[PDB]
Design a protein around this nucleic acid. Sequence first.
DNA 1: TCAGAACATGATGTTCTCA
DNA 2: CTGAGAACATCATGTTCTG
Lengths: 73, 77
Amino acid sequence: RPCLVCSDEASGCHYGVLTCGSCKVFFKRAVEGQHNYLCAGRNDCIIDKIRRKNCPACRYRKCLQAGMNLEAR
Amino acid sequence: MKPARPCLVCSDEASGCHYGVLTCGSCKVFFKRAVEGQHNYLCAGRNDCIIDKIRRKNCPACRYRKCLQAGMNLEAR
DNA sequence: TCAGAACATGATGTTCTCA
DNA sequence: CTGAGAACATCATGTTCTG
Ligand SMILES: [Zn+2]
Ligand SMILES: [Zn+2]
Ligand SMILES: [Zn+2]
Ligand SMILES: [Zn+2]
């Protein structure tokens, strides 16, 4: 489906998996970024176009479960 | 030290009744901010999200419910 | 075809008015 | 010594523009 991460309209395979424009950046900034993403549920959040801004911990955990690589070095 | 009573909404050390109940400076502006502008938030979970000082940004759909449950209101005239 | 500058914003806290 | 509302100054995600 479009964005095997947020179900929004994907722009094309990004970092290895089909994603929207947003998802691209999120996963770039998440990875190269000092963070402490903490979920406020049970690590099972729904993630769509709208519901995505909500939980970063799960969304990133999604930009990890479904391939999405930065690739070594 | 520095524990001046937890926000009835989130948990952060609040500061004086705001819009009806003990809330932080954060929650104060949120509840004023959540009512005026168009919002219609969407909870990304099972409508029971923790709203402590950290995760309070995560789900404003629940924090609002928390405000509406702590009886927050603009009072009126 | 896809990267990431880069320009959009958006959302949020913490002051600092004031009465 | 209140308890509100600017308006700051801060982040966080989204869009277009660039190779
Ligand atoms: Zn996406
Ligand atoms: Zn989550
Ligand atoms: Zn609070
Ligand atoms: Zn929620």
